Each structure stands twice: as C-alpha cells, then as structure tokens.
Amino acid sequence: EVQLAESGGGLVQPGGSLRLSCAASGFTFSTYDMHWVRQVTGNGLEWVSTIGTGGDTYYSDSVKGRFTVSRENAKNALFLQINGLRAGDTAVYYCARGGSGQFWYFDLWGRGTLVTVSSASTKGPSVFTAALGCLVKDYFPEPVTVSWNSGALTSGVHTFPAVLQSSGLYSLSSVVTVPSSTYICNVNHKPSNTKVDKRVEP
Amino acid sequence: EVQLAESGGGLVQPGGSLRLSCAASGFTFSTYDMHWVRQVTGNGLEWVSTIGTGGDTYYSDSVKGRFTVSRENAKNALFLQINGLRAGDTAVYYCARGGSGQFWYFDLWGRGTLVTVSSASTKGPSVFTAALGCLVKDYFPEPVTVSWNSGALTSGVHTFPAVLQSSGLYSLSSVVTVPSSTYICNVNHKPSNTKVDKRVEP
Amino acid sequence: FRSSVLHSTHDLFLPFFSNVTWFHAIPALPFNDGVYFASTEKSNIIRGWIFGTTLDSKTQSLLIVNNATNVVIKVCEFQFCNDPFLDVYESEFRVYSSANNCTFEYVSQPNLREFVFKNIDGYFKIYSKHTPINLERDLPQGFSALEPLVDLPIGINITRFQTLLALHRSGAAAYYVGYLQPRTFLLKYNENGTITDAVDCALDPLSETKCTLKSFTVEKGIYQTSNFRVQPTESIVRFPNITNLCPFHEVF
Amino acid sequence: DIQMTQSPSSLSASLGDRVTITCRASQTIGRFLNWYQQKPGKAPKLLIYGASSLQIGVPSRFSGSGSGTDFTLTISSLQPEDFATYYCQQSYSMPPVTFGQGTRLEIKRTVAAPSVFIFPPSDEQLKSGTASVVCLLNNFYPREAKVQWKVDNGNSQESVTEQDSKDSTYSLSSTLTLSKADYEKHKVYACEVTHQGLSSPVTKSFNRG
Amino acid sequence: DIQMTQSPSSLSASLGDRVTITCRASQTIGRFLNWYQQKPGKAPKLLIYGASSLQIGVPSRFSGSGSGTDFTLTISSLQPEDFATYYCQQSYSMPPVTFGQGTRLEIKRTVAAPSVFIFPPSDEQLKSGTASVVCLLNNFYPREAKVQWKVDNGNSQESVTEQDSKDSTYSLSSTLTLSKADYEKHKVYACEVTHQGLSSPVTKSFNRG
Amino acid sequence: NATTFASVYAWNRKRISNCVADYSVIYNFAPFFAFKCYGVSPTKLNDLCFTNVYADSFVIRGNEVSQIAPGQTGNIADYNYKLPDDFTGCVIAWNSNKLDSKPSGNYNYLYRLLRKSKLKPFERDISTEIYQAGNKPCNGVAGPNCYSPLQSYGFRPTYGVGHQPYRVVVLSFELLHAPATVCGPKKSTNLVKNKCVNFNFNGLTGTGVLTESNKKFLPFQQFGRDIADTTDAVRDPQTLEILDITPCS
Ligand SMILES: *[C@@H]1O[C@H](CO)[C@@H](O[C@@H]2O[C@H](CO)[C@@H](O[C@@H]3O[C@H](CO)[C@@H](O)[C@H](O)[C@@H]3O)[C@H](O)[C@H]2NC(C)=O)[C@H](O)[C@H]1NC(C)=O
Ligand SMILES: *[C@@H]1O[C@H](CO)[C@@H](O[C@@H]2O[C@H](CO)[C@@H](O[C@@H]3O[C@H](CO)[C@@H](O)[C@H](O)[C@@H]3O)[C@H](O)[C@H]2NC(C)=O)[C@H](O)[C@H]1NC(C)=O
Ligand SMILES: *[C@@H]1O[C@H](CO)[C@@H](O[C@@H]2O[C@H](CO)[C@@H](O)[C@H](O)[C@H]2NC(C)=O)[C@H](O)[C@H]1NC(C)=O
Ligand SMILES: *[C@@H]1O[C@H](CO)[C@@H](O[C@@H]2O[C@H](CO)[C@@H](O)[C@H](O)[C@H]2NC(C)=O)[C@H](O)[C@H]1NC(C)=O
Ligand SMILES: *[C@@H]1O[C@H](CO)[C@@H](O)[C@H](O)[C@H]1NC(C)=O
C-alpha cells in the first residue's frame, strides 16, 4: 500500500536538540514535495516547514531560525531537526506529502507523531444505585487506558482525559456505577512500570 | 458577438408621434420572431407588441389602436411606431427576439431604451463625525451623478435616486461624511451643461 | 535538412508571377497573411518597418527600428506618428512619443534585398537573402531561397504594416510589396540542403502535372491530374397547385 | 386575461442557500411558462424556458419545477451573481402574455440600524421662500422602513438606494418641500420613521430661528 | 499573514441532514483553498482541494463552494462516518500558509441534562495537604457546560469525554484543587454548575470528609 | 548584489526576458528575513516558465516588510507602492542596517506621505510637487501651511533601533498570451555513440544508434530528414556536430 512512517517523537528538555524522521512507501518519493504540520493539544493544524523537490527549504515565522528540515532522495527518508525547543512547541506533528498541481495541498498524510517539551519526569501516580469512582493525581502521559476490575466489569465505565499539572505531571478521573439499592479501579501506569489500584465499596 | 441595437427613445410631448428602431446582429434575422416588452420604473416586464416571420402584427389591449410595429427582412432592422402617447406610457422598452419552438419565449434581449412622455423641459440645478450633504431640487433626467470633492472622494459618499416633481422636474439627494471631532459637493448636469459646487461643515 | 529530394509543402508562399505592388515615397499597408518586402536602394534609405493592428493609441504593437550597424526591436505600446520617419540630425526617433507596457526588447546584429514576414503561428518569422543583381531596378529573373534569421517570440496579433524611411531632417525610396497566400509548392533540394528551384503547382496545368509526378521534368504523355465537376448553380422547388382554398372565408 | 401570482417581492438568504421561487397561475396553463433573470441596471435574461428546460449557459444550480397552476423555481447554491430580480411569464395564451410582479433576492445578514441624521440644506434654497426640510437614514440592513412628516410635532416622496455590495445595508432619504413664502409657516418640522430595528426617531426635528 | 475565519467550533445535525460549513478569508485568495477532514482518533485527510475539485475516494455527498473571500463546504446527507472535525486552509500565500480554527460535527438529539453528582475521594489524598473534590456531570447532550468552583460558598481544569456512540451525550468532570494548608484551612466547598435544563445550580455545597 | 539600492518613492523596476533565471542562485545570496511568496509555487518555480519576470528593488522601514502584500494597508502601501489584488510573485527582504552605515542618515532615501493614497499598482508617481495644504497654491513652492513635500527616511540610528532598514526585491512573474521564453535550466547528459539509446535532442525524441555523419547542414538546420519523412540526422547541440540516426538493429 501507500503510507508514510514516522519516528522520533518523545520528551525532550527545553532547548535540547531533536530530530524527527519520516519514511515514505508506495510511490516515487523523489518527485513529490514534503510538508510538516503540527497540531497543539486542543488546537488546530499549524504548518511548520516544508521542502521542495529541488532541495529548497521553507519555514514559518515562529519556526524559522531554530528548525532545520532535511530530505534524502534515496531510501525515502525524510528528517526534521529541531533545536532550542520550548514549552510552547508541544504539539502533534504529522508527515504530509505535496500533491501534483500548482498549489500546496496535502494529498497524503502520515501516521503522525507526538512531541512534548518539558523538564518534568515520570512519577508514580496515587489513586484515591450510585455513581462514583477513583481519583488519580500526579499522573504522566500513558499509552494504555484505565480499566475497572481488569476490564471484566460490564457496568457503566467511563474515563476522562488527563489535566495538566503545575509540575508537568497529569491527573486523571474515572467513574463507575455500583448497586446501592465494590469494584477495584485498576490504574496500570505503563511508563512507571508500576500498577496502583483502589476500591470504592459503599 | 450577438446583440440587438436600439435607438430613438427619448422625451416626447403627450400625444406626439414616436418611432423606435432595433437592429440585430450575429444571427439569421429573417427566421426569428421579434417582441417588444416595456418595463415601467419600479414595475415588472409588460409585453407591448410583436411581429412574426410572416409579417403579422399583434398588440396588447392597452397597446392596440395607437401602436404600429414594423420589421424589414433586410438590414436586420426592426421598428415600432407609436402615436398618441400619454404620461402612463413612460417605461423602459426592450428589443427582444422570439426563440425557435412552439411557444413564445425571449431567448435574446437587446440593450433596452428609455421612453418618457412629458411636456416639461430641462431646468438647471443648484446646491440646495457628522453626516450631511447637498440637496438638489428642480432637476431633470441626467446621465452623470453628483460627486464630492470634485470627484476625488468616494468612500463616504452616497447618492439617492431622484423623485418626480409635479411640474415634471426631478429632485436628487446626496450625502457625505465629514470629520467633526469641509468637502465641496459637485452637482453636475449634462443636459443643462451647468455645474454648481459648494462646501459643507458640521 | 533533406537530401536531393522533391518535397511538397503547403504553407504561405508568394504566388509565382503575381501582381506585386511597386511603391515610391515623396500611409499604411494591409497585412493579410504575410508581406514580401524587397528593395534595391541604398542601405541609408530604408531602416525598419512598423507592424500593428490599430496603431492609434492602444493594441500594443511595434517592430523593427534599424541602427547603422545594429538592430533594435521593441514591441511596446506606441502612440503612432502619422507618416513616421527616422531623422538624422545623429540617429533619433520621432514615433516614440509614449512607450508604455514594453515587452521583449531585442537587439542583434544586421545588391537586391528580400524580406518575408509571418505571424500565423504565434511567433514572428523573418526571412532574408542578399544577392547581386545585373538589372537596373527590376526584380531579378532567377531563383534565391530566403533563410530565417529572426524568429522572434512576439505574441502580437498583427494586421497592419508600414515602412520607415531615413530622412535627413528635410520618385524616391522605391520598394516592392507582395502578399502571401496558402499555396502548395514543390521544392527541389540540392545535395547540400539548399533549394535550387521550385514549382507553384497552382500556376498552370504543367505545374499541376509536375506536382502529381513529383518531378521537374515530365516525359511525353498524357497524365491524369485533377477532377472536373460542375457545381449546382440554382435551386428549384416544385409543388402541386393550391386547391380547395380553405373555405374559412365562407365562415366569416 | 391570464394573471400570474409570484412569490413575495423580496426574499432574504445567504450564500449557498436554497431558494425556491414560487409562482402560481390563475388557471391551468400546462407547461407554457418560462422564467427570466434581471439584475437591476441591465437587460433581463432567461434562465428556465418551458418550466422543464434549462437555457444554455446557465449554471446547473438553477432548477425549474411545477406545472399547471403552481411553478417553483428552485436554486440550490446561491452565488454573488445569482442575487437579482426574477419574473415568471405564462405562455399558454400567446397574444395576451403577462408577467409576474417580480421577486428580489437579497443577501441575509445581521439586522443593522438606520443612523438617523437631520441637517438643514444650504442657504441657497433657504434664500427663497421655497425651502426644503430633509431627513436622512444611513446603512440599515432591512428595507421595511417607512418615513412620514409631522408638521409642528408639504410631504414629498422618499428615496431608497440599492443594497450595498459590502455592508449589505440600505439607505433612505426623505424631503419636505415648501411653496412660495411657505418656509416661515411653521417653526418645528418632525421626521417620523418606523424601521425594523430602530424605535422612536421622531424626536429629531427642525428648530428654525 | 493571511487569516482564516471558519464556522462556529461546533455544528449540531442528525443523519441525512444538510450541513454547509462556511469559512471566510481575510482577503481575496481566489480559489487557492482546500478542505480537510480529521477524526480525533486518526490522522487528518483531505476532501476538497482547490475549492472546486473533489478528492478521489471521497463520496459525492461532500461538495465545496465559494471563492475569493467566502468558502462554503456543503454536505448533502450526513453519514455516521462523516461526523468529524474539519479545517479550511488558504493557499494563495504558500510559504505563509494558515489553517482555520476548526469545526466540530456532532449528532443532534434531545437536550439531555447532566446528572450532577459529587463524592469525596479516599483518605489517601487527605493524608497529603493537597486534597481535592470532584464534581461530576455525566450523560448530557450539549458540550458547553461551564463549571466553576466556589470556596466557602481553588478552581482547576475540567475534563470532558467524547460523545457516546449510542447515547449521543457528553460527560464532564471538574475537580477542586486545594494547595498547601488550603485543605486544612477551609472546610466548606461548593461546586458551581451552569447548564441548560437545570434551575441555575450556581452553588452546590459540600463538606470536607 | 547591486550594492546601490534605490529609494522606495522611485523604485527601479527591471524587466527580464529570454533568460534562464537560475532559480537556485536567489536563495544562495544571503539569509532572508522575509521570504513570502504567492500564487506561483516557489518549490515548483524552477519547473514552470513565464514570458516576463519583472524585478523591483527598493528599501523600506523594518515595520514595512509586512506591508508588501496584496491585502496591504499602510503608509508605504497606499502612498508609495501597491501590489495588485491578484499578485503572482515573491517578496524577498533582508537586513540592510549593515549596508547603510551612516550615522547621519536621511541620505538617498525618501518616501511618500500624502497626495492620492491607494496609488495604482506598478505606477511610479515620481513627479515632485507640493500638496495643496490650504487654499493658497503657494506658487508651487513651500510657504505658509503648505509644508507637504515627499519626506525622507531618517536612517540615523545605526545599530540603535529595531526598525532597521531592509532591502526588498519584489519579483513579478507574468504569463501573457505569448510564447514564454524565461524557462528553467535544461540539463544535458554525456553523448554516446555506436549503441542503441533513447535520445532526445532539443525535444526531438527517438530511438536509434548515433554515429558521426559526413553530411553538412546549413547554419540554421537543426533537423535532418530523408524520403518518407524519416528522421535520419540531428544537430546535436552543445557540440554542433552532425550525427547520423540509424534504426536499432
Ligand atoms: C544602436 O542603437 C543603440 C540603441 O539600442 C544605441 O545604444 C545607445 O548608445 C548611447 C550612446 O553610446 C548610449 O549612451 C551612453 O551609454 C553609456 C553606457 O555606459 C554611458 O556611459 C554614456 O554616458 C551614454 O549615456 C546608450 O546607453 C546606448 N543604449 C543601449 C540600450 O545600448 C547605439 O548608440 C546605436 N549605435 C551603435 C553603433 O550601436
Ligand atoms: C557550447 O559549450 C561547449 C562547452 O564549452 C563549447 O565547446 C567548446 O568549444 C571550444 C571551441 O569553440 C573548444 O575549444 C577548443 O578545444 C580544443 C581541445 O581542447 C583545442 O584544441 C582548441 O584549440 C580549442 O581551444 C572547447 O574545448 C569546447 N569545450 C568542450 C567541453 O568540449 C561549444 O563551443 C559551445 N557552443 C556550441 C554551439 O556548442
Ligand atoms: C495589378 O493590379 C493593378 C490594380 O488593380 C492593376 O492596375 C489597374 O488598376 C485599376 C484600379 O485598381 C483597375 O481598374 C484596372 O483594372 C487595373 N488594370 C487591369 C489591367 O486590370 C494592374 O493592371 C494589375 N497588373 C497585373 C499584371 O495584373
Ligand atoms: C500590458 O499588456 C498586457 C498583455 O496584453 C496586459 O495584460 C492582459 O493580457 C491579456 C493577454 O495576455 C489580454 O487579453 C488583456 O487584454 C490584457 N489586459 C488588458 C487590460 O488589456 C496588461 O493589462 C497591459 N497593461 C496595461 C496597463 O494595459
Ligand atoms: C556542396 O558542398 C561541397 C562541400 O562544401 C562543395 O564542394 C560543393 O560544391 C557544394 N555543391 C553545391 C551545389 O553547392
């Protein structure tokens, strides 16, 4: 098939060097232009930079001066080197291709990568007919969702997205329905390599 | 291109004779029927008369008896003779062509001519954050509009359509925007060949 | 390039034995499809030409103005000057009263002389040839092919033409003008690629014969050449008599 | 003899909206009906002929429907070039053809308010007894504005401009003409206006000295 | 430098309804505009490019319209796969390209009311000086539920889940954040709720556990 | 690289025609502060071709770099230089404070302030006069209250303000109804002989064996044909040697 790969997104200290990667497949990569568009959490798309077929590079107003886009004609390898990152640069980046024609439009999109710039670190979270649930504090960006009773529960289970904390951490909230005419909330924090749970029995 | 010419529409005394002219171009004129439709100021279209390929003539109820439509196969010339005009006949006449088919429909329209029946004559006009302007009274149908600052100011300039007077004259309104935290209007009149100007102040 | 072969081409050529207009100086001329220009005067008399469609104020168009040793081309929008001329005070211009919206200024290096102009493709073709003559002022009774030397990308629709004479700030300036028409010619190429002679196939039945046989020498015989056919001259419409008179008359 | 009843004189809609211009006949006329488009300031042009056929050169967004006694000219996506006046013509009776009263297509936006201004004319007209009293309205979106003249808390016809291409608002001007030696007949002249979006403008009146 | 103004952030409509997503530009950009579709669970994808050309693979129900300064993305019949976020982008000034703020497409249904619940956490957080109190608003159709906090009758960021695929309602979660010594200094708290259908629940008192 | 830039009130619009344009040399000059382009794709500029490329150079204030645009509004915009609503080109600007090293300033730099703002695009109003400030014409010279000439730019604070001068080079790419001559550069590969190759000589595509020929052409011949309209010879540009084309075995 035809798709665009991506790799290199992750946490980095403010001002540290970072280099993203994009790998195309399924077409003649040497005859199409590539673009880089980011999207802040809760915000819309924002064009970052692009490179034409002739090797010429272009950047945005707040992007030029610290970014550096590169592209190799062989191996379908696309790169984007960044330096001097700040907290305001945290956004979801996407690898896009410039379609044929006389104007810039993204006919193909990649998988997309997440880039977060902060000085914080991973910290173990603490977990704390009626409807109640468990409260999580001092969380961290996680790749797996929170489940109740290892997901075997068939009752009403919901999970809210995390909220930003002052020290760079997160906090998550979950609710559940219990009979009140008792389950265990399982918070399996993957980046901390430690699982924590609590109970909300009446 | 393909268009229909027109000439002869103008001021005429009540009951005086009048003959319009229409000239086609860009198609075979001898194989299409022609129709005459008028449009009173502020009113809709009104069919006046017509003539077919065979030379037969037809008129409306309030039109038959005083009108006379004629058409020549050569020179693509179309005419419409009128006699016994009155004030109620003031309307914009359009030269229209009847399209091929079984029913009457206007597939081609001309430039259109204005016919006004009145016994009056042309009379010279005169100049009669805040917003004010120059009033015009005792006016006449004109081809040029009132301008401000000798025609150099057009942003905050507006011109109202004229209104008919009892003696056959006109009255036009014009306003302008001046600073009030000084522009000179120019009332031009081509049929009178006289221009008047005067400044304003808040 | 082609070898010693006979190639039939259909393009705008000057018909053989045509009625070429002879002009003398002391207005403009039409431009139907191409003007054949020729003159035997000195090089200090004729020094350029002006082309255009409506040379009054608009329809941007202008053409050659000649130096003494250089060529100057410009197609700016020109306010044309009736009876234009180049004055020698010392070279100066008089027709350039207002040069606006200029485009493609071109400069290059520049006996009986011949010139051919064409604009039918979108470009501006110019062909020239310089050969010595033995007559006084008449055209030479010979053959000489004109070679392209300009081929400019000027994209202006040209419909009028007028020459420029060199006047020294105050029966003369004789030049020939011919018009081109779409004709079929049989061109003979030499072994080196030069045209030695040609045949205007629409001139006489003998040329029509040399066209079908594709040879300048025709052997003794009878040759089928073309097809004769008489075209319909008038039209006849016939129908039976009108009868029964539509007795509607008796109804009224 | 045949009469036509078209849609109201004005229809308000925005770009890309769907407008169904309805026009009914006095009796069954079959399909002998055609439409016309006329932007104010130039000659009309036909769009639908025969109530089923489309004129060559007209975009596919226009569509004619209905037959017999009710006809509906339906537009799918309004464009800036579509805002104009439309008329329906019957063709069942060829000699006595008639047209509808017309229907205006205006741009829909917020309901602006008329900036009611009042100012005296120049002294040139005031020099003679035949003076004038004017009233001004500037940049109001609706068109249902009615102006009267109150004498001491001579009336003439008012004037209305076309809809602005940018502000999409109308302007209205009124005047009060006086006869010879009639200027000093009254000291106060009130301008009474009623507009959809502005109330009580009658307080603005002339105060002669 | 060029800025784009799209439709409101959210649009409510049901299946098969007609949606006309309007997006205007700061000046005349001609036809150098393209539309994109982005589901919050996957990468974006283009639908209309050049404001007149349809992308291959997109169903014919999507249609782009408008040019110059106003563009309208018209959808004829909404499908379950059409409910997503859309963005407009100008292409006139290609190096300084800018995107729209976005427009959400949600399923229209009855106006559900949020079941307001509040419960204190365990003593594990009360052991620390930074306690918390949550205020739950679950299963309500709208999304603009403004929730605040009142101390003795601090505020923090709330959290909202995506619209349910069966109930077509949103769920909101707000939390009261108390800093050091604020958990031990203040004892009475109140959740401020504002949403359609409720009798102005500006104060929902609560006592520290 | 003119090193002698003109003033904004009198910009030196230079016309380019029948050139290669070497679009790879523009961004190799110096780091540009403003590299905004328009409806002509910059990444695809080297592939397109235009009839006339109009170059325009001038100097403006540091706050005026955002003023050279179609949707413009400002002093330099309405009074000095205006781009059309549909502009197909680019705007290149870089720091010019190092070049104008003169603490005195005000030299060789002037601009417009009044006198018929919203000037028509690409029209130079260099006619020097005095605006009609007041009723008296002031005899066409300065006098009471008629102090309205075209003003000069005070580039005095060298390295002392953020409003440093910037040199702007405006490019106007236009494609009229005429054969375009300002195209991109055309690459050329090495010539091979005595082997079947897919050749392309100045647009003449074909397949065959290229061999040296003894035939001599005329100076304007770039195409060799034989009977039956076959292509048996070419000019082989960049070497001007005539090659014989025989069909592959
Ligand atoms: C042929 O026609 C051309 C016009 O296309 C004439 O060229 C012009 O010649 C004058 C006189 O030499 C030039 O003026 C001088 O230019 C030099 C340039 O450095 C300048 O230093 C002098 O002070 C003086 O202004 C003019 O620039 C030149 N124009 C062009 C476009 O070439 C030429 O004189 C004619 N005759 C010949 C024999 O070429
Ligand atoms: C197009 O560009 C090519 C590349 O420069 C030109 O070819 C060059 O032609 C000159 C002669 O005009 C050659 O100089 C000669 O070189 C030989 C061998 O070194 C030497 O014996 C002679 O005395 C003379 O110096 C030059 O070498 C040659 N360059 C190459 C790379 O072959 C060509 O003339 C240009 N024009 C055309 C129409 O092709
Ligand atoms: C070439 O054309 C000219 C111009 O037609 C011929 O000269 C005479 O011109 C007048 C006025 O135009 C005509 O009425 C005469 O009929 C022309 N003469 C003849 C004989 O037709 C001139 O004769 C033509 N020459 C040739 C060789 O055809
Ligand atoms: C200068 O000439 C150009 C070239 O004609 C004008 O641009 C338009 O060009 C097209 C074809 O390329 C013509 O069909 C148009 O008629 C031209 N425009 C006009 C207004 O005629 C350009 O407009 C000209 N400049 C001026 C100031 O007239
Ligand atoms: C053809 O060219 C050759 C070589 O230059 C020359 O010897 C011969 O005379 C030429 N023939 C003609 C007819 O010009």
Cβ distance B126 to D124 less than 8 Å, yes or no, reads yes
Instruction: Output the CA–CA distances (angstroms, integers) from residue C134 to C24, C112, C141, F178, in the order listed.
Output: 21, 10, 10, 43
Cβ distance E96 to A61 less than 8 Å, yes or no, reads yes
Question: How far is CA C159 from its chain centroid?
Answer: 11
Chains in contact with C, counting 3 or more C-beta pairs less than 8 Å apart as contact: F
Q: Please say whether the beta carbons of B89 and B32 come within 8 A.
A: no
Ligand 1 binding pocket mutation candidate from C67, C73, C108 (most atoms within 8 A of CB): C67
The reply to whether ligand 5 has any atom less than 6 angstroms from the CB of C192 is yes
* C–F touching, 3+ CB–CB pairs within 8 Å: yes
C172 Cα: distance to centroid of ligand 1 (angstroms): 31
Instruction: Output the CA–CA distances (angstroms, integers) from residue A3 to A24, A26, A107, E18, E74, in the order listed.
Output: 6, 7, 11, 32, 29
Cβ distance A160 to E173 less than 8 Å, yes or no, reads yes
Please give the structure tokens belonging to residue B59.
Answer: 């008129």
Q: CB distance from D59 to chain E under 8 Å?
A: no
The reply to whether ligand 1 has any atom less than 6 angstroms from the CB of C69 is yes
F17 Cα: distance to centroid of ligand 4 (angstroms): 17
Run of H or E including C250? helix C248-251
* Alpha-carbon dihedral angle through residues B136, B138, B144, B150, given to the nearest 10 degrees: -40
Closest C-alpha residue for ligand 5 atom 7: C192
Question: For residue F238, is it left (φ>0), alpha (ψ between -120 and 50) or beta?
Answer: left
- Is F66 strand, coil or helix? helix
Q: Please say whether the beta carbons of B69 and B51 come within 8 A.
A: yes
Strand partners, A65: none
Cβ distance B135 to D119 less than 8 Å, yes or no, reads no
Give dist(CA C43, CA C63) in Å, integer.
18
Please give the structure tokens belonging to residue B93.
Answer: 């006449």
Give residue numbers after which chain D breaks (C–N above 2.5 Å): 153
Q: Please say whether the beta carbons of C198 and C143 come within 8 A.
A: yes
Sheet of D33-38, strand order: D10-13, D103-107, D85-90, D33-38, D45-49, D53-54
Q: Which residues of B fall within a CB distance of 8 Å from D34?
A: 103, 105-106
Single-letter residue type at B126 = S
Single-letter residue type at C241 = N
Cβ distance F216 to C192 less than 8 Å, yes or no, reads yes
Q: Which residues of A fall within a CB distance of 8 Å from F24?
A: 54
Sheet of E188-194, strand order: E146-151, E188-194, E204-207
The reply to whether ligand 2 has any atom less than 6 angstroms from the CB of F205 is no
Give dist(CA F155, CA F75) in Å, integer.
17
Side-chain-facing half-sphere of A147: CA atoms under 13 Å? 10
Single-letter residue type at E14 = S
Q: Which technique was used to obtain these atomic coordinates?
A: cryo-EM
The number of the ligand 4 atom at minimal distance from the alpha carbon of F175 is: 12
Q: CB distance from D74 to chain E under 8 Å?
A: no
Please give the structure tokens belonging to residue B167.
Answer: 């003696």
Q: Which one-letter DSSP state was computed for residue C208?
A: H
Single-letter residue type at F11 = W
Give dist(CA B21, CA C230) in Å, integer.
44
Q: Residue A54's closest CA among F25, F49, F46?
A: F46
Strand partners, E13: E107
**Number of residues that make up chain E:** 209
Q: Please say whether the beta carbons of E170 and E184 come within 8 A.
A: no
Cβ distance A52 to F39 less than 8 Å, yes or no, reads no
Cβ distance A137 to E132 less than 8 Å, yes or no, reads yes
Give me the DSSP letters along B133-182.
EEE--SB---SS--EEGGGTB-SSEEEEEEEE-TTS-EEEEEEEEE----
Q: Residue E162's closest CA among A159, A162, A39, A137?
A: A159
Q: Please say whether the beta carbons of B90 and B18 come within 8 A.
A: no
Q: Beta-strand (E) ranges in D14-102? A: 19-25, 33-38, 45-49, 53-54, 62-67, 70-75, 85-90
The reply to whether ligand 4 has any atom less than 6 angstroms from the CB of C21 is no
The closest ligand to the CA of C75 turns out to be: 4
Q: Which one of F179, F181, F225 has the shortest CB-CB distance to C2?
A: F225
Phi/psi at C173 (nearest 5 deg)? 55, 60
Question: For residue C188, is it left (φ>0), alpha (ψ between -120 and 50) or beta?
Answer: beta
Single-letter residue type at D71 = F
Give me the DSSP letters along C88-153.
E--EE-SS-S-EES----EEE---EEEEEEE-TTSSBEEEEEEE---SSSSPPSS--PPEE---B-
The closest ligand to the CA of C67 turns out to be: 1
Cβ distance F39 to E95 less than 8 Å, yes or no, reads no
Chains in contact with F, counting 3 or more C-beta pairs less than 8 Å apart as contact: A, C, E
Cβ distance B131 to D136 less than 8 Å, yes or no, reads yes
Tracing tokens 């006699």 back to the chain, one arrives at B83
Give dist(CA B183, CA B155) in Å, integer.
12
Question: How far is CA E23 from its chain centroid?
Answer: 18
The reply to whether ligand 1 has any atom less than 6 angstroms from the CB of C108 is no
Cβ distance A56 to F35 less than 8 Å, yes or no, reads no
- State the first-to-last Cα distance of chain C, in angstroms, to the nearest integer: 86
- Is C60 strand, coil or helix? coil
Please give the structure tokens belonging to residue F6.
Answer: 């003109």
Give me the DSSP letters along B67-88.
EEEEE-SSTTEEEEEE-S--GG
Q: Which long-range contacts (CB under 8 A, 24 or more apart) does A60-67 make?
A: A60/E96, A61/E96
Question: How far is CA D44 from its chain centroid?
Answer: 17
The reply to whether ligand 5 has any atom less than 6 angstroms from the CB of C43 is no
- Is C213 strand, coil or helix? helix
Closest C-alpha residue for ligand 2 atom 32: F239
CB count, 10 Å around CB of C242? 7
E28 Cα: distance to centroid of ligand 4 (angstroms): 21
Tracing tokens 């030049």 back to the chain, one arrives at C175
F216 Cα: distance to centroid of ligand 5 (angstroms): 9
Please give the structure tokens belonging to residue B40.
Answer: 């009173």
Ligand 2 binding pocket mutation candidate from F188, F201, F238 (most atoms within 8 A of CB): F238
The reply to whether ligand 1 has any atom less than 6 angstroms from the CB of C70 is yes
Question: For residue E37, is it left (φ>0), alpha (ψ between -120 and 50) or beta?
Answer: beta
Q: Please say whether the beta carbons of E193 and E201 come within 8 A.
A: yes
Give dist(CA F198, CA C180) in Å, integer.
40
Instruction: Output the CA–CA distances (angstroms, integers) from residue D25 to B33, D30, D49, D75, D89, in the order listed.
Output: 25, 10, 16, 20, 9
The number of the ligand 4 atom at minimal distance from the alpha carbon of C60 is: 2
Single-letter residue type at C21 = T
Q: Please say whether the beta carbons of D187 and D152 come within 8 A.
A: yes
Q: Which residues of B fall within a CB distance of 8 Å from D43?
A: 94, 109-112
Single-letter residue type at B12 = V
Ligand 4 binding pocket mutation candidate from C101, C102, C104, C157 (most atoms within 8 A of CB): C101
Phi/psi at C75 (nearest 5 deg)? -115, 30
Instruction: Output the CA–CA distances (angstroms, integers) from residue A69 to A14, A40, D13, E104, in the order listed.
Output: 19, 20, 48, 32
Give dist(CA F58, CA F91) in Å, integer.
11
The reply to whether ligand 1 has any atom less than 6 angstroms from the CB of C101 is no
Q: CB distance from A47 to chain E under 8 Å?
A: yes
Give dist(CA E25, CA E67) in Å, integer.
9
Give dist(CA C6, CA C57) in Å, integer.
48
CB count, 10 Å around CB of E139? 18
Give me the DSSP letters along E129-196.
S--EEEEEEEEES-S--EEEEEET------EEPPPPTTT--EEEEEEEE--TTHHHH--EEEEEEE-T
Give dist(CA C142, CA E52) in Å, integer.
63
Single-letter residue type at E36 = Y
Contacts of D103 (CB under 8 A, 6+ apart): D6, D7, D8, D9, D10, D11, D21, D23, D85, D86, D87
Instruction: Output the CA–CA distances (angstroms, integers) from residue F78 to E1, E145, F152, F170, in the order listed.
Output: 18, 47, 17, 17
